[PDB]
């Protein structure tokens, strides 16, 4: 589905900042140009632009999140969070299915806005129950937005708190992404230094850091494995995470993607519930075959392949669908996509012969 021409015009009308994004669960895409926002249904052939230009300052992040229960009328399916350099703005959204292809979409103002504060917002994630978490490229702190139905004299309808609190003595480090796992009430952050932090939503408004695992720990774990490799060193970056839900696995909590194309599967255990320890257990090394125009003529562990070097972006979806954006050239991306060999996995016997085919 080609990007509609009316936003290509707006994109080139940009002065300082533009950004694109996806709302795949309702079939909408979006583009921000400075202090303006535009949504459209990409399944539609001649889409109408749903614009929101009330924003005064440059938009830095937008996300589509479930609403908090008992706050809005039932016809509101989602909440649209719009972060600018000045404010975090909440909008009501109804994506009801009128009537043929995608969900007809309407925006509602809420009179809910918080000062952005000193910390940039580039990453917005939401939970099943409508909790909204924020993070960005100023630091590693995680913020949460509360919002309420009532006007109270002592509180406000809309608030923002910092769940991290650092003291003095700081070091430069910021976030690369935020990741929710509702089945375990966990939140994961990934930093630019490839540090993985795990937070537990112990209570309905509480968030608690329970694990911090830096690259060094991952590398020590990796060293104690029978097979070390040049594809994972202290020079290597972790570019993406993908949580694994509790319904898919008990032990393996998280997958981490290196820029050399290695998938690291990390377990996490309680000492007894939130986890307190995280460990690199299993590595899936890259495939060897590179893409070709002409077909080519087709048992030891291959731990040196560079077919996925460099991996810029990475996504994992249950039950193991893997997408890797390989940026071999500065101009065109190649897409590596794999799935579990379900057939061979269920045929394999006995249990000890099972490999990640």
């Amino acid at each position: 589905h080609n990007i509609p021409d009316k936003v290509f015009e707006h994109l080139n009308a940009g002065e300082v900042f533009t950004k694109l994004g996806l709302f795949a669960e309702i079939g909408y895409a979006w583009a921000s140009i400075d202090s303006s926002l535009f949504l459209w249904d990409y399944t539609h052939p001649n889409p109408e632009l749903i614009g929101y230009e009330e924003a005064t300052h440059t938009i830095t992040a937008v996300a589509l999140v479930p609403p908090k229960p008992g706050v809005f009328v039932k016809t509101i399916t989602h909440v649209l969070v719009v972060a600018t350099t000045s404010e975090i703005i909440l909008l009501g959204v109804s994506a009801t299915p009128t009537p043929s292809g995608s969900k007809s979409l309407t925006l509602y103002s809420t009179r809910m806005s918080v000062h952005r504060g000193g910390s940039d917002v580039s990453f917005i994630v939401g939970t099943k129950d409508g909790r909204i978490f924020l993070g960005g490229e100023s630091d590693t702190d995680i913020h949460e937005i509360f919002y309420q139905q009532e006007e109270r004299w002592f509180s406000s309808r809309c608030g923002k708190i910092n769940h991290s609190h650092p003291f003095g003595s700081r070091q430069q480090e910021w976030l690369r992404g935020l990741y929710v796992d509702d089945t375990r009430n966990l939140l994961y952050s990934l930093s630019n230094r490839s540090t993985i932090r795990t937070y537990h939503m112990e209570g309905p408004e509480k968030l608690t850091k329970v694990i911090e695992k830096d690259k060094t720990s991952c590398l020590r774990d990796f060293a104690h494995m029978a097979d070390s490799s040049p594809l994972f060193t202290d020079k290597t970056n972790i570019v993406a995470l993908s949580p694994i839900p509790a319904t898919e696995a008990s032990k393996l909590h998280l997958m981490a993607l290196t820029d050399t194309g290695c998938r690291l599967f990390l377990s996490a255990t309680s000492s007894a519930l939130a986890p307190q320890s995280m460990q690199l257990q299993f590595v899936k090394f890259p495939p060897r075959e590179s893409p070709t125009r002409i077909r080519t003529l087709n048992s030891q562990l291959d731990k040196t392949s560079r077919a996925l070097d460099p991996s810029a972006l990475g996504f994992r979806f249950s039950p193991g669908y893997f997408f890797d954006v390989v940026r071999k050239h500065p101009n065109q991306d190649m897409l590596f996509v794999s799935a579990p060999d379900t057939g061979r996995i269920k045929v394999t016997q006995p249990a000890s012969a099972l490999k990640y085919f």
Binding site: E48, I50, G51, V71, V73, Y108, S109, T110, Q149
Partner: peptide, 14 residues
């Protein structure tokens, strides 16, 4: 076309 923003009154109950 600027999207029509329906009011808060409809949005949040009760």
């Amino acid at each position: 076309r600027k999207a029509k923003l329906l009011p808060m009154e409809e949005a949040l109950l009760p």
